[PDB]
Ligand binder design. Structure first.
Ligand SMILES: OCc1ccc(NC[C@@]2(Cc3ccc(C(F)(F)F)cc3)CCN(Cc3c[nH]c4ccccc34)C2)c(N(O)O)c1
Ligand SMILES: Nc1ncnc2c1ncn2[C@@H]1O[C@H](COP(=O)(O)O)[C@@H](OP(=O)(O)O)[C@H]1O
Length: 258
């Protein structure tokens, strides 16, 4: 196809929850658009100063009166969300995913993606990387590796609060598998009920380029396979290597598509 000059603004809002292929999708969107896509990894590796800004936004988010129409407080919240996303062409993962409805209002010409998978596969992956149970010895390893990356209790607070925001829960028993599974199903159902079907593409793991590129009116990237990255096995290796070497920069060449 012809090469066209794309606008550097949010063009794709991904509502999929963590551990549903968000990092592969982030990489795929960057391959298509040649501009950055937001993701929790963007916070960890490039924008740790944003943690407090996202926390402030979530703290104020209960004051969002759903447009139409737009109220004054909603403008202030929407302005900070637009500021956080300046320079990006897409959003994936926490903390953004729970803001899908607000992002749809801020970027009325953006399209929405929802990545889904088997709920028990999702929970297993979540417990190995994002939310280990409080009695799991692996949790102490994750925390040791996280300190190497400079992540403190405020980072864990952001993950917890952005998950609570996505699930629309005032509190959440993070150690309760039944609660998490029910929240997962209700969240994915709600996205499909809320977003007009014309504006939504539901993606399953393994779907690859073709449905995504058709939805976005772009050519399939020539000679580039669809990304497959961020397996729990790979995250376990990363944690162990951070513990062993005590720095990101000593191991970063071992993890190419991070
Ligand atoms: O790809 C989607 C996606 C992948 C991972 C995460 N987070 C996993 C975590 C951050 C992390 C660490 C290392 C790396 C790496 F890759 F550099 F190694 C990446 C990310 C989140 C925090 N910690 C668990 C924890 C330990 N004690 C807690 C107490 C309360 C709550 C959580 C925790 C690992 C998210 N989040 O958090 O949205 C999204
Ligand atoms: N192209 C692809 N095909 C199949 N699974 C993929 C994939 N890209 C990522 N995944 C899976 O999606 C999960 C990572 O999602 P996220 O990036 O949102 O954290 C991992 O699950 P597992 O942990 O079960 O391996 C990973 O294996």
């Amino acid at each position: 196809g012809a090469m066209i000059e794309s606008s550097t603004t949010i063009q794709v809002i991904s509502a999929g929850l963590p551990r549903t292929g968000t990092k592969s999708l982030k990489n795929a969107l960057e391959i298509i658009y040649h501009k950055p896509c937001y993701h929790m990894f963007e916070i960890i590796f490039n924008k740790q100063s944003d943690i407090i800004k996202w926390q402030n936004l979530i703290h104020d988010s209960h004051m969002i009166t759903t447009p139409p129409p737009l109220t004054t407080k909603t403008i202030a919240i929407y302005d900070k969300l637009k500021e956080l996303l300046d320079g990006y062409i897409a959003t994936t993962d926490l903390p953004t995913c729970g803001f899908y409805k607000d992002l749809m209002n801020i970027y009325p010409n953006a399209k929405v993606l929802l990545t889904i998978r088997d709920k028990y596969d999702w929970l297993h992956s979540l417990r190995k990387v994002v939310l280990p149970k409080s009695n799991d010895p692996w949790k102490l390893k994750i925390e040791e590796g996280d300190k190497v990356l400079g992540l403190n209790s405020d980072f864990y607070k952001l993950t917890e609060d952005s998950l609570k925001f996505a699930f629309q829960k005032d509190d959440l028993n993070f150690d309760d598998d039944q609660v998490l599974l029910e929240c997962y199903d209700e969240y994915n159902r709600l996205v499909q009920e809320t977003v007009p079907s014309d504006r939504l593409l539901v993606l399953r793991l393994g779907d690859g380029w073709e449905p995504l590129c058709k939805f976005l009116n772009v050519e399939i990237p020539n000679g580039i396979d669809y990304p497959c990255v961020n397996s729990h096995h790979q995250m376990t290796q990363l944690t162990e290597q951070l513990i062993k070497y005590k720095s990101l920069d000593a191991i970063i060449h071992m993890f190419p598509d991070l």
